[PDB]
Design a protein around this ligand. Structure first.
Ligand SMILES: OC[C@H]1O[C@H](O[C@H]2[C@H](O)[C@@H](O)[C@@H](O[C@H]3[C@H](O)[C@@H](O)[C@@H](O[C@H]4[C@H](O)[C@@H](O)[C@@H](O)O[C@@H]4CO)O[C@@H]3CO)O[C@@H]2CO)[C@H](O)[C@@H](O)[C@@H]1O
Ligand SMILES: [Ca+2]
Ligand SMILES: [Ca+2]
Ligand SMILES: [Ca+2]
Ligand SMILES: [Ca+2]
Ligand SMILES: [Ca+2]
Length: 1055
């Protein structure tokens, strides 16, 4: 433009160091940005440092310990500001600094100047900035160069940025090929688009509520966003004299959606078999170039095809021969990445990959419909359990499982199928026969921990050593062991398993040697939960016998087929769309963020950094093209792999609307698909309505309930130390069998029982019960740590559980909490009593694999990387993996003392207890499915039929008494054998007698009668007059038999 100002640096040299510290000295410069804008020489007499020694930093020699002393004035100064020479007692360590003008802080942050990061002890700072810089030049270019990324190009014409508020020059500079910066003289010569102040739209406000308080700026209606977005984009502000105010990078995901998403959403992505051949398509609306690289089976480039860019969508496409089926491929990108600030060139696998090479290095063209990739009969495979009505869904009884947890240890699984999808076909193995038994008794669904492509297992078998293999193999592949306390064992000729067993002997809270070795094993074994997504829509390769190419696809479907057809269970998949394993332009597992940088990840609105609140690299499902990729992904798992439902990890990091959108999309494919998820944190309500327990009321989207879970288990997931033992649950005898440490009051115990009863009636917000004080309360009025307790509209929106893959197993919680006088048999009943609140409740029942086997992880709280050793499940029923070493010290170190106290209170369960627990478990699940009354499905039907006795301040503590009405009132006899059901769970050491049903013709269920001495109700007595005496630690299911007509049943009372 002819006129208008040239934005430029301050006309002054980039400063050097004023002085350098000598011995026993440190030096601090204050780079006076405002006085570098010159005119008069500023005066620095009022500048002073406050300097003091504490315990973290003690290197100062003459620190003044009086805040009102402003005498530590600059040693000298020049045009760039003052500096201080600080005497020291030493040259290592650190010093504490506060920079002041008088007693006012110019930097409102205690400065830790550590001579480790700063070898020459000569640092610089700027006012209003907590950063400690290496040199005055660095600090100067921080102030007068591009920093952060707080500008937000949110649609075509709207740009939000605080740094340009009320300032004369505000513009959007850009360079196709290089990083915007001042030129040889000192001016910003690059092209720009001028910005005018404006007011945020109602659509920008609705779209980005967490930004609607940013100062808004308008772009020319004719601006060419295609060209701007090709390279680095940098918003700049400047004074009247053209001096640079601030300059920041731009986040563009808003405008990318405004510009391209409408067109890009109508397209299909990945390597797609058609009639004419194969269409490749990838979305890369900012890339300068995309070439499709075709690879031979041995990974030699055999063709390279520049792709065609569609300017409306920003998608790139290429069409080739149908002979490309089976070919490996990547996308060679030429694309600017805001994090590196450079135009990167790298090859990336397809985010829409549906097949992969070993370890996910290349994607592969595949037609998932090929009969070659299907087990015989696949096309006719049906769901063994219905999921159509709410009553169908309430029957769901989930068994949460992991591919290695299932088979890694089962000697009766062929050695080569161990830890593999195909282990589920080993029809005579202990593991599969055990699962068949569980299914026959009423476990209806297997939920699989991550079986999409995860990043954290090396699928090259030659770089892996598992504990069943020689210890010398572990030394080969894990160079770290050779320099470790176990190095002597490389010669042993014994397996790692055999070694770890020997380490149990001397293992203790002082000598945690089992865990010490296992930490090394964990680095290079085959084991991980897998919450670490590499590709969302390919199976994991390490669980295939052959991870190269398409074999894993047929092996996966063969597993799926055996579960439905041979075990008789539906399959749920854990999915993890809330984060990616990595982001940025360099990491091997950064896929989405290499192709469309800063679009698929959720970013800090100020720094532009990829957030990590999930654990890892947070994703952005509020962005339209990630929403599409999620829905497309689930479509494949639904249709091509016949997955019956999905559990979303950290679902509350997703918009409610996005999750409902994905659900309507998938229901168009199969109406019976069930969606549910877990969540507690997020802190994303500022950006959108999150998909949380509270917000999902009425949607039919299920959520894990932590209410009954914590009431029955006791305590909470963040307890540590003695609190693990004091915070007894209903299942472990809160109030009624106190241990030596607890101070649980009767009121507290009765509070837990309110939460438990609420959960057994499906945790509905509007269920009305009598609370711990005899007060009438709606479910939402029962407190849960501040939140409303009951939150749902139907029991099918609530997933009850008392054990899960994450946090301590149920058995380990009982071991922490059970009084010394509870013997081994009483603790087994505690496990069953605990599980009974889930299995006999109206919420969907969920449980961890092996709870029927008293599963233990040796007190490990978080076993995601704790290997075969601590996650062992022994389907030969020799033990429950209890007491196999102290858990990992890095996470449970603070628990070693309480563990040592409690650990050896009773014997370790052996085969007798394991068989007894399993019978108890099957008894519970056979009861759950013995009557429609347990699984009403609909929350209004729950309210009209479900009540509780033994409530109020004078209840018998720990006795849970639920009634389910099948009588003349409420409605019709959904159950032709009974007019009502009584569920009684006597979680207490005393025998108890019920009088609430005197004269009523009550009788024990046939299932519990059949089990005889093995029943949870063994010893129950029903007297002639209908009074019922319940043993200690018992579970009893009673029914009023039904006559030629429908009896009066157990009418609910209007409270
Ligand atoms: O070597 C001693 C300590 O020196 C430094 O502490 C400084 C602070 O940085 C100054 O800000 C100030 O502290 C004020 C404080 O800001 C003021 O609010 C008030 O503190 C209140 C406090 O708000 C309130 O929560 C409650 O605790 O009452 C306090 C007073 O009892 O008063 C303070 C005194 O001026 O001055 C101190 C000087 O000691 C340095 O930051 C420390 O790390 C260091 O240990
Ligand atoms: Ca230096
Ligand atoms: Ca993998
Ligand atoms: Ca591992
Ligand atoms: Ca935020
Ligand atoms: Ca009936």
């Amino acid at each position: 433009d002819p006129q208008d100002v040239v934005v430029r640096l301050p006309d002054v040299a980039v400063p050097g160091e004023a002085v350098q510290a000598s011995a026993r000295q440190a030096v601090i410069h204050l780079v006076d940005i405002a006085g570098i804008t010159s005119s008069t020489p500023a005066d620095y007499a009022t500048k002073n440092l406050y300097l003091w020694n504490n315990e973290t930093c003690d290197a100062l020699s003459a620190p003044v310990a009086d805040w009102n002393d402003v005498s530590t004035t600059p040693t000298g100064s020049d045009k760039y500001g003052p500096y201080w020479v600080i005497p020291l007692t030493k040259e290592s360590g650190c010093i504490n600094v506060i920079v002041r003008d008088g007693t006012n802080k110019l930097i409102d942050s205690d400065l830790r100047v550590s001579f480790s990061d700063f070898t020459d002890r000569t640092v610089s700072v700027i006012a209003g900035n907590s950063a400690v810089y290496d040199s005055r030049a660095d600090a100067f270019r921080a102030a007068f160069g591009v920093a952060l990324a707080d500008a937000h190009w949110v649609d075509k014409t709207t740009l939000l940025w605080p740094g340009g508020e009320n300032k004369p020059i505000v513009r959007l500079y850009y360079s196709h090929s290089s990083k915007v910066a001042a030129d040889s003289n000192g001016e910003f010569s690059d092209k720009y688009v001028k910005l005018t102040p404006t007011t945020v739209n109602q659509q920008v406000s609705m779209r980005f509520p967490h930004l609607a308080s940013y100062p808004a700026f308008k772009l020319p209606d004719d601006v060419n966003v295609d060209e701007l977005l090709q390279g680095e984009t940098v918003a700049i502000a400047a004074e009247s004299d053209g001096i640079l105010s601030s300059a920041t990078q731009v986040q563009t995901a808003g405008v990318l959606d405004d510009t391209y998403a409408a067109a890009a959403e109508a397209l299909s992505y990945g390597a797609q078999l058609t009639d004419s051949g194969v269409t490749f398509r990838v979305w890369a609306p900012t890339a300068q170039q995309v070439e499709l690289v075709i690879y031979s089976a041995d990974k030699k480039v055999i063709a390279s095809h520049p792709m065609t860019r569609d300017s409306a969508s920003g998608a790139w496409s290429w069409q080739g021969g149908s002979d490309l089926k089976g070919a490996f491929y990547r996308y060679a990108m030429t694309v600017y990445h805001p994090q590196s600030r450079k135009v990167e060139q790298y090859e990336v696998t397809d985010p829409y990959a549906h097949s992969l090479s070993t370890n996910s290095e290349y994607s592969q063209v595949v037609d998932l419909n090929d009969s070659a990739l299907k087990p015989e009969g696949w096309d006719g495979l049906t769901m063994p359990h219905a999921q159509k009505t709410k009553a169908d869904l309430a029957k769901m009884t989930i068994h949460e499982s992991h591919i290695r947890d299932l088979s890694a240890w089962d000697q009766t699984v062929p050695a080569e199928l161990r830890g593999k999808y195909l282990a589920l076909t080993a029809q005579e193995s202990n593991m599969v026969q055990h699962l068949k038994q569980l299914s026959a008794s009423g476990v209806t669904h297997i939920e699989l921990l991550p079986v999409f492509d995860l990043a954290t297992v090396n699928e090259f078998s030659d770089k892996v050593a598992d504990i069943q293999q020689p210890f010398s193999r572990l030394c080969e592949v894990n160079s770290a062991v050779k320099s470790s306390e176990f190095a002597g064992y490389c010669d042993s000729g014994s397996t790692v398993e055999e070694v770890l067993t020997q380490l149990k002997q001397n293992d203790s809270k002082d000598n945690p040697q089992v865990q010490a070795l296992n930490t090394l094993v964990a680095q290079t074994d085959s084991y991980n939960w897998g919450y670490d997504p590499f590709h969302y829509t390919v199976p994991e390769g390490s669980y295939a016998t052959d991870p190269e190419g398409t074999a894993r696809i047929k092996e996966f479907r063969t597993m799926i087929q055996a579960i439905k057809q041979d075990l008789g269970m539906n399959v749920i998949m854990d999915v993890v769309y809330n984060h990616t394993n990595a982001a940025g332009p360099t990491d091997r597992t950064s896929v989405l963020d290499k192709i469309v940088p800063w679009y698929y990840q959720r970013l800090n609105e100020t720094t532009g950094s990829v957030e990590s609140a999930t654990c890892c690299s947070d994703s952005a499902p509020e962005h339209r093209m990630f929403a599409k990729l999620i829905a497309d992904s689930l479509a494949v798992w639904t249709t091509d792999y016949k997955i019956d439902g999905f559990r979303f990890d950290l679902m509350l990091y997703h918009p409610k609307a996005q999750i409902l959108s994905a659900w309507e999309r998938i229901k168009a494919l199969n109406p019976d698909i069930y969606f549910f998820g877990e969540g507690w944190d997020s802190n994303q309500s500022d950006r959108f309505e999150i998909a949380s327990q509270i917000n999902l009321k009425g949607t039919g989207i299920g959520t894990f309930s932590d209410r009954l879970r914590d009431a029955v288990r006791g305590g909470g997931p963040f307890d540590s130390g003695d609190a693990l033992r004091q915070n007894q649950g209903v299942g472990s005898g809160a109030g009624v069998l106190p241990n030596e440490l607890t101070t649980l009051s009767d009121d507290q115990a009765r509070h837990l029982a309110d939460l438990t009863r609420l959960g057994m009636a499906g945790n509905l917000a509007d269920f009305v019960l009598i609370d711990k004080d005899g007060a009438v309360k709606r479910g939402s009025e029962i407190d849960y740590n501040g939140a409303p307790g009951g939150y749902a509209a139907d029991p099918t929106e609530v997933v009850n559980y008392v054990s899960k893959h994450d946090n301590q197993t149920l058995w380990d919680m009982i071991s922490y909490k059970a009084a010394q006088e509870a013997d081994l048999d009483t603790r087994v009943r505690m496990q069953a009593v605990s599980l009974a609140t889930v299995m006999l409740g109206q919420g969907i029942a969920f449980d961890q694999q092996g709870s029927e086997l008293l599963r233990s992880k040796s007190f490990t709280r978080d076993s995601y990387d704790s290997g075969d050793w601590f996650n062992r499940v022994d389907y030969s029923l020799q033990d429950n993996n209890y007491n196999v070493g102290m858990p990992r010290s890095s996470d449970d170190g603070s628990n070693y003392d309480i563990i040592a106290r409690v650990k050896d209170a009773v014997a370790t369960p052996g085969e007798t207890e394991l068989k007894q627990m399993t019978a108890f478990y099957q008894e519970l699940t056979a009861l759950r499915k013995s009557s429609p009354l347990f699984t009403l499905g609909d929350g209004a039907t729950v309210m009209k039929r479900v009540d509780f006795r033994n409530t109020g301040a004078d209840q018998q503590t720990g006795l849970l008494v639920m009634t389910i009405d099948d009588g003349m009132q409420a409605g019709a006899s959904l159950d032709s054998r009974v007019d009502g059901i009584v569920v009684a769970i006597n979680a207490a050491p005393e025998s108890r007698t019920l009088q609430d049903f005197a004269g009523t013709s009550l009788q024990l269920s046939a299932i519990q009668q059949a089990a005889g001495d093995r029943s949870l109700a063994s010893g129950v007595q029903v007297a002639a007059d209908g009074s019922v005496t319940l043993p200690a630690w018992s579970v009893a299911v009673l029914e009023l038999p039904q006559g030629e007509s429908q009896g009066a049943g157990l009418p609910v009372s209007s409270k």
